């Protein structure tokens, strides 16, 4: 029905595919940050996951905040002691954009444990808006996933939760995930979740919609599979903890598949 916007979904998909290219952060950016690293970024993103859980925020808000952080850090050098300030302001901005009831500024100050002042958070909010030129309506993995989910017959709640779990894991690790577009990560996440739960593969109807085949998705899929396998040993554990809950059907407790059983023509493969 109209909640699925039949007359516009294809226009919207085409537009989002245009915009994700324009909203893409710089792939190499951390190499050009003298004071911060991918490991520090992982700590920050993992913390934002915790914040999102604590304040019961939308996963979309979390994805938006990460996009803002990566775009900001693509343009602006930030010292280590100020990284969490960028993150806090990003999460505040994402919340104002996306949430019906965003937390008040005082709650964002509280979550940072009084390292920063309220003035600092507010001034950083303004700086982030300037640097991003108010361009905050970024396409997320989540936005593509919900569109992909409509191709289920019927809907599978464990598939949906696991795909979201895998998409979320990708936010933690700039290497490799910065080189992949949200539509591609969502596609690889959907396939991997579909296969883990049901044994099914990336649907033909989504091949026609997205133009993505398992062949084009392979590099991202192989990365995501490895991330999934190594997940219980990752330094960052908030997403796994989150997805143990009944809300997400305890999908982080599921065993990842040992192999993807992808097509290999050679006898020795």
């Amino acid at each position: 029905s109209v909640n699925e916007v039949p007359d516009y979904h294809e226009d919207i998909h085409t537009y989002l595919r245009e915009m994700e290219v324009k909203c893409k952060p710089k792939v190499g950016y951390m190499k050009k940050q003298p004071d911060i690293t991918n490991s520090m970024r992982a700590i920050l993103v993992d913390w934002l996951v915790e914040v999102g859980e604590e304040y019961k925020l939308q996963n979309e808000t979390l994805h938006l905040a990460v996009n803002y952080i990566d775009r900001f850090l693509s343009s602006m050098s930030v010292l280590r002691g100020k990284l969490q300030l960028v993150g806090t302001a990003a999460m505040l901005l994402a919340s104002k954009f996306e949430e019906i009831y965003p937390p008040e500024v005082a709650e964002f100050v509280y979550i940072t444990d009084d390292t920063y002042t309220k003035k600092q958070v507010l001034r950083m909010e303004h700086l982030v808006l300037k640097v991003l030129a108010f361009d905050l309506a970024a396409p997320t993995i989540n936005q593509f996933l919900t569109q992909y989910f409509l191709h289920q017959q019927p809907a599978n709640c464990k598939v949906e939760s696991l795909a979201m779990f895998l998409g979320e894991l990708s936010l933690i690790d700039a290497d490799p995930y910065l080189k992949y577009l949200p539509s591609v990560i969502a596609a690889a996440a959907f396939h991997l979740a579909l296969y883990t739960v049901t044994g099914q593969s990336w649907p033909e109807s989504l091949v026609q919609k997205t133009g993505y085949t398992l062949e084009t998705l392979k590099p991202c899929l192989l990365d995501l599979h490895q991330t999934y396998l190594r997940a219980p040993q990752h330094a960052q554990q908030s997403i796994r903890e989150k997805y143990k809950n009944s809300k997400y059907h305890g999908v982080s407790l599921l065993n990842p598949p040992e192999t993807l059983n992808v097509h290999h023509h050679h006898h020795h493969h």
Partner: protein, 267 residues
């Protein structure tokens, strides 16, 4: 930062901020300035501004008001908009006795649907389509304005803010508090506006939520409108949000086969 602008008169106050008519002293351009106060020690930049600026920077269409510049001071934000001479509410009031010619009504509705189709195609719900937010110029154009209550939506939609759309233009699915609402809510509003252009009276001027619902129940269960007009209107005001016509489909309706672009009709 605002040295080049000379304020002329106060225009009014919309969803947020204050709007002034101003002139650019260097280029001669007449603009509308929306002044937004921050809030620098408490809540920062309002979500209304964040949404309107972000979305209006994306939305470039003849029937959506043009955002020209954002001037980013420490304590205030100034949005520079194109100036439009009149709003549709004032125009209808000015036309209370004369009426509005059908070709202009048809042109305005066609353009509003073009603008709205553009919004929905770019995942934006307006959610505040009332005559006060529809702006007209001397050349026959009409444009959507005040995106303070607008929202970028996902597919499929999830639950959004309930306190949306001023009472008179509020779709039944909002009034009854359905957990989901979509692009259909904007169509309802434009249907109400269509009727209001024909009569120069609000279609459902409810005094309360119950009165609002009763007024809707009466009518569905506009004299001077032809068969094609009433056909389109009934489809724009369908009770079922699923059955309600889309802006896209509305543009293809027989009512518009002979559409032109007349000039108002009053100054």
């Amino acid at each position: 930062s605002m040295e080049n602008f000379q304020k002329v008169e106060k225009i009014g106050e919309g969803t947020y901020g204050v709007v002034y008519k101003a002139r650019n002293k260097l280029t001669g351009e007449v603009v509308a300035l929306k002044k937004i106060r921050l809030d620098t020690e408490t809540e920062g930049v309002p979500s209304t501004a964040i949404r309107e600026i972000s979305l209006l920077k994306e939305l470039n269409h003849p029937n959506i008001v043009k955002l020209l510049d954002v001037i980013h001071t420490e304590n205030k934000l100034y949005l520079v908009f194109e100036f439009l001479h009149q709003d549709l509410k004032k125009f209808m009031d000015a036309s209370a006795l004369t009426g509005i010619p059908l070709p202009l009504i048809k042109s305005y509705l066609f353009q509003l649907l073009q603008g709205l189709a553009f919004c929905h195609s770019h995942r934006v719900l307006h959610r505040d389509l009332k005559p006060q937010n529809l702006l007209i110029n001397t050349e026959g154009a009409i444009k959507l304005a005040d995106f303070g209550l607008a929202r970028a939506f996902g597919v499929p939609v999830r639950t959004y803010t309930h306190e949306v759309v001023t009472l008179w233009y509020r779709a039944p699915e909002i009034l009854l508090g359905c957990k989901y609402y979509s692009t259909a809510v904007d169509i309802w509003s434009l249907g109400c506006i269509f009727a209001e252009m024909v009569t120069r009276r609000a279609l459902f001027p409810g005094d309360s939520e119950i009165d609002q619902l009763f007024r809707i129940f009466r009518t569905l269960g506009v004299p001077p409108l032809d068969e094609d007009g009433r056909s389109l209107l009934s489809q724009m005001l369908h009770y079922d949000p699923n059955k309600r016509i889309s802006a896209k489909a509305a543009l293809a309706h027989p009512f518009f086969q002979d559409v032109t672009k007349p000039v108002p009709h009053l100054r």
